[PDB]
Design a protein around this ligand. Structure first.
Ligand code: HEM
Ligand code: HEM
Ligand code: HEM
Ligand code: HEM
Ligand SMILES: [S]
Ligand SMILES: [S]
Ligand SMILES: [S]
Ligand SMILES: [S]
Ligand SMILES: [S]
Ligand SMILES: [S]
Lengths: 146, 140, 140, 146
């Protein structure tokens, strides 16, 4: 996907301020709470019976850290997302069979987490740039379905 | 099905929105127009630039509709009946677009209410906006 | 909102399905499993091969649920309440998948009822299956 | 997208029997009837007030003929759908701003029309092959959004 230099600037400046140890777990936890059918894929994570149990679950925080690292890798390779996410696409598509609509959902939850964390700093133009990114990541993760 | 806890959560979060409701509706619209440019074709007679008085005035109408839905959360099909007729019959709004505006409304709430936008309240607000969207698309 | 004409159309088309309802439900399931392989993960304990007795038996259950929905078209949330609990709470079926099965049910009806599957009846059946899907996903 | 030789065989044999002057208009008409918001894009077509008016509309039949020709062109270039639909993608995305979800809808309506026309000949394996095709066409038409 193609961001303008101003879009790249907006995305890069905000991402350098993200707590990479926490935001991934926050987005994954909210995905499991808001879209409860995604809990089907995380049976081995233990207690997901309540929102507090989800957000306090150490396996959720740990796995969210890996998810955020993949988004960081996408941000560094904005015009080769397909090659970047190739092995991840085979995992999610060929072995896990996650419906790709859920890639869009997780991306939109990440956008909600960034808005929550950054407040008025997460301006409409900054959001518009992040929507391009999360859409490109979702599309690249789904290429093995395409 | 909005649970009792969902209705309590939605009442609380929207109650804290207060008299900013009009401004937040306008911001959600701007967020949608910039993030999802296909939605702009429904407003060719609007000036969609930042600070537009038409977007500000329309955002107040949107906020007032949601406030009506909150106040009549057990009877939303009836409360929003005229609005569902408008969107489906006259405007012929693509149902995909209600998901886009709902997402931008959540983003707007998240950006303005850091204390209220907990995971539980996030879940309740998403279900609420999905319920509003279902009513507004029920009449094709 | 199913219109009076929609209910008449759905009653007529499903009435012509007759005692083939079980077989058509099984065919719609096979269509879904082959066309949309992600749906197969919900049935790991099924043999999904052609002619499978488990798919045939399940297709009859699906057809009987739709027949119940037709017979109680004005009261579908109540009639399908136990089914919505099952799909949302226990099975945690992704809502996307109801669109896939609904499409395969329409394809199955089209392939077996050339006279009944007019554009008007096609529209009514799509609205009916969307209404069933909305009920079955209402309980997450 | 990649069809197996058996999938290609199933698709090609059925498509050679399609009435290319009628099936496109049938799918477009049903799209306008079943998904009425799509009528927003066809104001210049005249009477679309009833299903009979839609299916009997000469502009609907005429335009459906062009749509079917584009599907035929996709069937002949199954591994360069992106290049095949490039100018069509710019038209639908950059100038018309059709939401790409509607490309999937039209593809699924075409599948319904083929099932109606061919009956038991439109077997589940034949359908599965056509779903791959219409998904690939929809994805290629949406590339200018991607
Ligand atoms: C933007 C979307 C997503 C990204 C970037 C992402 C990223 C990742 C990463 C980096 C891993 C670790 C792979 C490894 O250990 O080598 C992973 C694993 C996994 N993901 Fe995701 N993911 C996404 C969406 C989803 C969604 C929506 C679901 C379920 C609803 C899901 C389910 C899983 C599961 C079950 C695993 C564990 C697989 C295993 O350990 O074998 N993913 N994901
Ligand atoms: C939560 C979702 C929505 C709510 C609560 C809502 C509410 C409203 C309200 C209250 C009005 C004004 C009614 C009147 O003045 O009589 C309106 C008008 C309108 N809405 Fe929405 N709406 C929603 C979603 C959408 C979406 C998704 C679109 C298209 C992308 C859309 C497009 C329009 C248009 C084009 C008008 C007419 C504006 C004008 O010509 O002045 N709406 N809506
Ligand atoms: C029109 C839509 C649907 C209808 C009417 C329907 C109906 C039913 C019925 C009647 C049962 C059996 C209930 C019982 O035996 O207690 C059932 C079970 C089940 N359904 Fe559905 N269903 C629909 C959609 C789906 C979809 C889209 C999926 C997943 C892709 C799904 C997955 C399942 C599963 C996994 C079971 C349990 C089967 C077993 O373990 O024996 N259903 N459904
Ligand atoms: C698989 C999906 C589709 C295919 C293959 C397709 C194909 C075509 C073709 C071949 C044309 C004629 C272009 C020309 O004259 O050079 C066209 C035009 C057009 N299409 Fe589609 N189409 C698709 C989906 C849609 C949908 C879903 C809509 C609306 C809901 C739509 C709206 C239009 C409009 C308004 C035009 C006229 C544009 C103009 O004349 O300037 N298309 N399409
Ligand atoms: S994940
Ligand atoms: S505009
Ligand atoms: S709106
Ligand atoms: S299976
Ligand atoms: S099912
Ligand atoms: S079209």
């Amino acid at each position: 996907v193609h961001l303008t230099p101003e879009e790249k600037s907006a995305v890069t400046a905000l991402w350098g301020k993200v707590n990479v140890d926490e935001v991934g777990g926050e987005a994954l936890g909210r995905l499991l709470v808001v879209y409860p059918w995604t809990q089907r894929f995380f049976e081995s994570f233990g207690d997901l019976s309540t929102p507090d149990a989800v957000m306090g679950n150490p396996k959720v925080k740990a796995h969210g850290k890996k998810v955020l690292g993949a988004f960081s890798d996408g941000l560094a390779h904005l015009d080769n997302l397909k090659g970047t996410f190739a092995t991840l696409s085979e995992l999610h598509c060929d072995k896990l069979h996650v419906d790709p609509e859920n890639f869009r959902l997780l991306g939109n939850v990440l956008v909600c987490v960034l808005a929550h964390h950054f407040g008025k700093e997460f301006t409409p133009p900054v959001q518009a740039a992040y929507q391009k990114v999360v859409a490109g990541v979702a599309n690249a993760l789904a290429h093995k379905y395409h | 099905v909005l649970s009792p806890a969902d209705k309590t959560n939605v009442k609380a979060a929207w109650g804290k929105v207060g008299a900013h409701a009009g401004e937040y509706g306008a911001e959600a619209l701007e967020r949608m127009f910039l993030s999802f440019p296909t939605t702009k074709t429904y407003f060719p007679h609007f000036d969609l630039s930042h600070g537009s008085a038409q977007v500000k005035g329309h955002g107040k109408k949107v906020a007032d509709a949601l406030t009506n839905a909150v106040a009549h959360v057990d009877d939303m099909p009836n409360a929003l009946s005229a609005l569902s007729d408008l969107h489906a019959h006259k405007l012929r709004v693509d149902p995909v677009n209600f998901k886009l505006l709902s997402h931008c409304l959540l983003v707007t709430l998240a950006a303005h209410l850091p204390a209220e936008f907990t995971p539980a309240v996030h879940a309740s607000l998403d279900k609420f906006l999905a319920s509003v969207s279902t009513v507004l698309t029920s009449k094709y």
